[PDB]
Design a protein around this ligand. Structure first.
Ligand SMILES: CC(=O)N[C@@H]1[C@@H](O[C@@H]2O[C@H](CO)[C@@H](O[C@@H]3O[C@H](CO)[C@H](O)[C@H](O[C@]4(C(=O)O)C[C@H](O)[C@@H](NC(C)=O)[C@H]([C@H](O)[C@H](O)CO)O4)[C@H]3O)[C@H](O)[C@H]2NC(C)=O)[C@@H](O)[C@@H](CO)O[C@H]1O
Ligand SMILES: CC(=O)N[C@@H]1[C@@H](O[C@@H]2O[C@H](CO)[C@@H](O[C@@H]3O[C@H](CO)[C@H](O)[C@H](O[C@]4(C(=O)O)C[C@H](O)[C@@H](NC(C)=O)[C@H]([C@H](O)[C@H](O)CO)O4)[C@H]3O)[C@H](O)[C@H]2NC(C)=O)[C@@H](O)[C@@H](CO)O[C@H]1O
Ligand SMILES: CC(=O)N[C@@H]1[C@@H](O[C@@H]2O[C@H](CO)[C@@H](O[C@@H]3O[C@H](CO)[C@H](O)[C@H](O[C@]4(C(=O)O)C[C@H](O)[C@@H](NC(C)=O)[C@H]([C@H](O)[C@H](O)CO)O4)[C@H]3O)[C@H](O)[C@H]2NC(C)=O)[C@@H](O)[C@@H](CO)O[C@H]1O
Ligand SMILES: *[C@@H]1O[C@H](CO)[C@@H](O[C@@H]2O[C@H](CO)[C@@H](O)[C@H](O)[C@H]2NC(C)=O)[C@H](O)[C@H]1NC(C)=O
Ligand SMILES: *[C@@H]1O[C@H](CO)[C@@H](O[C@@H]2O[C@H](CO)[C@@H](O)[C@H](O)[C@H]2NC(C)=O)[C@H](O)[C@H]1NC(C)=O
Ligand SMILES: *[C@@H]1O[C@H](CO)[C@@H](O[C@@H]2O[C@H](CO)[C@@H](O)[C@H](O)[C@H]2NC(C)=O)[C@H](O)[C@H]1NC(C)=O
Ligand code: NAG
Ligand code: NAG
Ligand code: NAG
Ligand code: NAG
Ligand code: NAG
Ligand code: NAG
Lengths: 318, 169, 169, 318, 169, 318
């Protein structure tokens, strides 16, 4: 009579790694490194905006592309490669910092700044900002002299943030194609624009000169921005080449922004994103994208790390 | 037509448990799984799994741009920092798994020994180890007797006389 | 009124040591702690502690400002780097403790087995395991005899005849 | 006769975590994560300065607030939220870099730069820098024309660092409230200030314009700084709107700077600080402040991680 | 002129293996190394080595300058990030080695026990443990008999009568 | 008769550390932390250039020091402390970013930009750029008026990158020692230089003023650079104080740059470098240099971490 103690085993064994062995077979194992990508932006439960052709910074200035998003609200913000912040050729100073701010803003609330002008044109428009006809940035005012080559009066405009949140203020400096064009628009002589706050001080001079044609235009408007603390005031002193804001921006709350080139799905629920889609996984690691954002498993170099979920496999003696 | 336990080979027929019993008597051969040892090993392995499922509440946001590449200097600093961190987590992941797997294997071997040592203590002086993970029982042990061993209701006092006799001569 | 050792239960009365002896004879019942096994376990646990007390000589200085917030871009890079590092150390801490605790428990179980196996080798053929961490001694073992076992001065040759007799019949 | 082997146990068991179990009881455990904060700055053994209302950068320029610290010496430097670097409204360019330098300077040693002037006022003072009466930055000279609207002579001032340590040189550019005020102080025409070294080259133009009143003033002075290598020379070429330095700064040795809002204690001895006080602990980790500085345990997310200091607790069968 | 095995002392004369046998009979004293146990331990230790030799394909480039020092702010951020990472790897290295060494020692002790337990199962009822890692063999065991034990060709049935006799009286 | 089981041991035992013990002896151990440095740059298999006195940025502009490297090609690039990017005193804007780009460029391919000039001198030379006689940067043109104090004509030069790789374009702004010298070279009046691309817009004004003599000169040329995308165009609008490029640069492929003060060896083969030489090691860690680059073991604080390669050493009872 005999009794034996034993353990189960399989012929269907899978190899794993230990401190000592490499490729030791165990009975059962599971993957710890996620590689299964969902090629969509799973947005269920999240208020989502697809800016498309509208650049994120464009939501503040307001090219035609961003007319729908001038006061948008969202939990999830999606930038697209086709997006553009600009109609009239130009770029933001410290653009990326501003993007990072807007990506988690929860959207923007616009409020008039209440600037009034006399002895001056404000109807500055261009062919690059076509909205039905020639137009301009929706939130901005292109200020000219009055007739042609006429002197631009020195002006001083101020604005106080009477709210409890910081105000996002954007202004633009216009760089004409020639000193001839600058004079035709704002008059002769050198031009200065100063922007004063209670924690900010900067200065700006235009730079007329020939540049490659972008959107048919050789002129440039570079935008500048600051955050205005509550009850603080910004003051604009200028005499030409100044793109004035009409409204200020206030951040709604909280959100997250991503850059993607794949469609959106309001059925799937996710919390970790990358340009290629959504990573939904309980696994600790992933090998899909190092720049994945949201609540994600840590990115690793390896595509596979098997965790033994069973004992060491020892085949039966036949 | 001999039977053998652990120590050179497992049982591909033990399909209702991780650890088990295999006996042979006049009634023939039989194999049954032990619950307590199997459940212990499963509880520990599943315990590891839940531990590696515990998600992080740390949210991370974009720090660069893959449409409009950021400035070179800060961009290279960012890339250098990220690649350094990836090296760390890749290392941690590699080490974590290798460490856990070594432990999973060892705790599994531990359970096997504990079961074997338990049975050895049940049989007292009524059996001997054959060196293949089995016990040669020096008395008649029918299916009911074998079952008594599996549920720890085996009283060695009952078979001691008969066994010691057969052992000594 | 039986006594039991390790294997299902510890002793809440053993208050002068970690590991110990509990006997019963004609003189009654008694319990004493083993020094060598207890000291080994304590030396190893304290060894871990000193290891985790070894301070760092790395000094770190302020890299941002909580009165006058730094520039957004470099500020977010800094925050992103710090939060990434905190994730790493939080992971390391979690893993370190869980690893050490598993080892502390296992080395403690190891010491228990080593003590039990030592006593088993002392008693030779003069005793049998009852399966509860105890040894049934098949001869008269007074308090002096019990003490002889605890300080490893027990000579099995002295009781071998008397014990083998009582064991065999 | 019977002898049993056993181990101790308690009813007073504490739970810990392992690789496998969560909440397994052991006999004894200790904490690894420090949460016990000392709401003071333990400064025993360390030469400590509490700048209070003086901003750290103010120690170089010398507003009235920093008159005691113009040549301070310290091992531990403490910034306060009420601190200000400024009397006349303005700010430093690359301020934070400069702060980081001064925090570990060990204090500053001032030395005259030896600038002499002719055909010019140097007694420029303001109501914002009141010291008994109206005054100015203690280490700086506010240069004017001479009378009013008079032309400011082109000047060129140079200074060599004859020492073995780098010299900290600070100068200021004054931005008047109007081009009228700029002319009244420094005369008509455009103004230029150039600063030349042997590893540094920069240029500066003033920016007159209306700004919000700070300390009753709408003008701004923005300060600029460089480190002068030994035996190297700085040269200042200017014609107005220039705030000249009177003395240069030299770093004493080594120190550490913190920002705090809690009192100082010269009885307690510490080496890890945060805004809320001192962390004294032999524990490997802490959950008090991620931005804690000095010699500190690593910051972690968890408030508690128990380390088993005793065996697994198994209760006795009753 | 007694011999002893593991348990208080190793053998500085065992120079052709890690684990081994030491016997004494009428032919005298002899010492031989066991291959299977020694090779197991060596394969595991070398296994660790290859694991720590696995090089990284991550290439890193210069992020600052030691001829022309970069800007202070970004320079301090870089230094702060690097020093933070060095702290992490210094920790990892310290922990890795301490962890591996503890395991190397333990797996080595494991192999010793496995060899001892194997021999114990070979000798069956023909021997007794002396408590010094040795077996008192209760029959005549010449060099050929000793060699039979070392290569697992020892049949206990052959000496059982002679041994049980000498054991019982 | 007796048989004993045992394990080997030595008197030659080495101490290691574990989780529990500190200095526990084992039979055998090996080092994991590399400290053995090879005081050479092991360059076997790698096409290597030793710039020596030539600064890396100098390879683009072309001082006399870099005449051999104007179109260099390499796998491994070595900067030397004696290196200088400059003949006529000056510095690059965003120099380090540019260095990082060139270190992994694989060398540079130069191509003419095809600028032609009329009514203007281009033979601007200096004593600081001596090449046989007085000369200038090899890839650049120093543009003057024509005679002396004569007016510099407004000019506009453009260049399209007709290639598939980005083009590296460098230009310089000249800062004269005085407004007198600026006028003598480029004529009276204020001077402007604008640089326009399709993703870049900047502006530049010279800053005449006295500066410390470097190489006998008190004037400065600061260089500026951009990367031109394929098929995109750069346009230069200027009227003086402009240092024009003659050729553009194109990156050859891939390389790695190091800074070293030790000799080169084309016999040794390495892949991890530092200023003190080469680290060749299969060990996981090193304690030589934290800033080591290439494919390296991770840097650690500790000089020694012994890995037990043998069992715990237990001495025989004598
Ligand atoms: C600069 C250049 O390339 N050199 C020319 C050649 O190119 C022409 O240049 C002119 C002048 O720059 C270009 O004129 C511009 O064309 C635009 C369309 O491409 C547009 O029509 C511009 O007009 C508006 C506009 O509609 O946007 C009119 C708006 O009312 C204006 N708004 C305000 C508030 O003033 C606005 C502004 O005047 C400017 O946008 C501010 O910068 O613009 C118009 O100025 C012309 O398109 C270019 N044509 C081509 C084919 O490149 C050739 O003429 C070349 C011939 O040999 O001569 C060079 O000198
Ligand atoms: C600018 C503005 O707000 N618009 C005005 C309104 O506000 C007044 O503006 C004037 C001019 O800016 C203010 O005058 C300034 O007041 C200061 C106190 O608040 C101070 O008195 C200034 O004088 C000194 C000074 O003491 O600091 C005199 C020093 O001697 C000067 N030092 C040197 C070396 O020159 C110094 C300098 O002149 C400047 O500081 C350099 O920038 O300043 C003095 O200039 C006046 O305080 C403002 N008052 C109020 C109530 O806001 C109103 O006047 C408004 C009425 O409708 O009209 C606007 O135009
Ligand atoms: C500025 C200063 O230190 N103050 C002077 C004192 O110093 C002299 O200054 C003058 C003017 O700055 C120095 O003249 C320069 O000397 C150079 C050698 O050191 C060199 O000879 C310069 O000439 C060239 C050159 O060869 O590089 C001539 C080239 O043909 C020019 N190229 C072009 C395209 O124009 C070139 C340019 O003119 C400039 O480099 C552009 O910045 O330079 C020459 O200008 C003189 O060397 C200084 N001497 C000393 C001893 O410091 C003294 O004269 C002092 C006496 O009291 O008076 C101060 O005003
Ligand atoms: C092999 O391991 C996997 C992973 O643990 C087991 O699959 C799990 O099964 C349980 C219960 O059925 C589920 O709760 C888990 O979600 C499953 N995980 C995965 C990844 O599918 C599987 O059961 C194991 N194989 C055997 C034969 O036991
Ligand atoms: C429970 O563990 C703690 C921590 O190790 C023990 O407290 C230590 O006691 C020793 C000696 O008395 C001191 O050197 C340590 O500084 C103490 N640490 C702390 C955190 O207080 C405690 O003794 C243990 N409990 C028992 C019953 O042994
Ligand atoms: C002590 O350990 C070292 C390191 O493992 C051993 O040296 C190795 O020997 C093997 C075979 O001879 C080589 O493949 C390795 O490259 C060697 N490593 C080093 C660092 O030299 C050494 O053999 C061990 N000592 C003993 C007595 O076994
Ligand atoms: C708001 O601003 C005014 C001046 O604009 C100032 O007097 C006041 O102190 C500020 N704060 C509050 C709470 O009104
Ligand atoms: C950062 O890494 C990405 C992906 O490797 C690369 O495309 C990008 O150029 C890097 N950033 C910089 C500034 O080079
Ligand atoms: C860095 O983190 C702190 C604390 O979370 C936050 O207040 C601060 O705004 C962050 N920095 C930036 C630039 O947002
Ligand atoms: C110091 O500066 C002078 C000129 O100012 C220079 O000639 C000298 O070489 C420098 N170094 C020493 C050690 O004098
Ligand atoms: C970075 O560290 C190096 C070496 O410790 C030091 O020399 C350098 O000054 C540091 N960088 C800055 C910006 O201080
Ligand atoms: C190249 O540039 C020209 C104008 O310079 C433009 O028309 C064209 O679309 C660009 N691309 C190609 C592929 O030609």
């Amino acid at each position: 009579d005999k009794i034996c103690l034993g353990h189960h085993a399989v012929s269907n064994g899978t190899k794993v790694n230990t401190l000592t062995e490499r490729g030791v077979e165990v009975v059962n194992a599971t993957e710890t490194v996620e590689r299964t990508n969902i090629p969509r932006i799973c947005s269920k439960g999240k208020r989502t905006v697809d800016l498309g052709q509208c650049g994120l910074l464009g939501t503040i200035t307001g090219p035609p592309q961003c007319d729908q998003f001038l006061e948008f609200s969202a939990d999830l913000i999606i930038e697209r490669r086709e997006g553009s912040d600009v109609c009239y050729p130009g770029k933001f100073v410290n653009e990326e910092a501003l993007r990072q701010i807007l990506r988690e803003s929860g959207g923007i609330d616009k409020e008039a700044m209440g600037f009034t002008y006399s002895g001056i044109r404000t109807n500055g428009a261009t062919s690059a900002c076509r909205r039905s006809g020639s137009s301009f940035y929706a939130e901005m005012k292109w200020l000219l002299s009055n007739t042609d080559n006429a002197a631009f009066p020195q002006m001083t405009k101020s604005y106080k943030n009477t709210r409890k949140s910081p105000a996002l203020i954007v202004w633009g400096i216009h760089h004409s194609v020639s000193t001839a064009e600058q004079t035709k628009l704002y008059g002769s002589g050198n031009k200065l624009v100063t922007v004063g706050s209670s924690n900010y001080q900067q200065s700006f001079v235009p730079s007329p000169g020939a540049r490659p044609q972008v959107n048919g235009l050789s002129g440039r408007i570079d935008f500048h921005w600051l955050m205005l603390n509550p009850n603080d005031t910004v003051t604009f002193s200028f005499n030409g080449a100044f793109i004035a804001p009409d409204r200020a921006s206030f951040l709604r709350g909280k959100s997250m922004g991503i850059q993607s080139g794949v469609q959106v799905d309001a059925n799937c629920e996710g919390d970790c994103y990358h340009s290629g889609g959504t990573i939904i996984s309980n696994l600790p690691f992933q090998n899909i994208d190092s720049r994945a954002v949201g609540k994600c498993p840590r990115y690793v170099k390896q595509r596979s790390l098997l965790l033994a979920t069973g004992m060491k496999n020892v085949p039966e003696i036949p | 037509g001999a039977i053998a336990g652990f120590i050179e080979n497992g049982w591909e027929g033990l399909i209702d448990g991780w650890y088990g019993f295999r006996h042979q008597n006049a009634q023939g051969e039989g194999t049954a799984a032990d619950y307590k040892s199997t459940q212990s090993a499963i509880d520990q392995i599943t315990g590891k799994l839940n531990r590696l499922i515990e998600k992080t509440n740390q949210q991370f946001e974009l720090i660069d741009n893959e449409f409009n590449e950021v400035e070179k200097q800060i961009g290279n600093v960012i890339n250098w920092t990220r690649d350094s961190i990836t090296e760390v987590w890749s290392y941690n992941a590699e080490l974590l798994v290798a460490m856990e797997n070594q432990h999973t294997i060892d705790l599994a071997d531990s359970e096997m020994d504990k079961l074997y040592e338990r049975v050895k203590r049940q049989l007292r002086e009524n059996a001997e180890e054959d060196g293949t993970g089995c016990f040669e029982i020096f008395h008649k042990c029918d299916d009911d007797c074998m079952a008594s061993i599996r549920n720890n209701t085996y009283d060695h006092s009952k078979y001691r006389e008969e066994a010691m006799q057969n052992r000594i001569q």
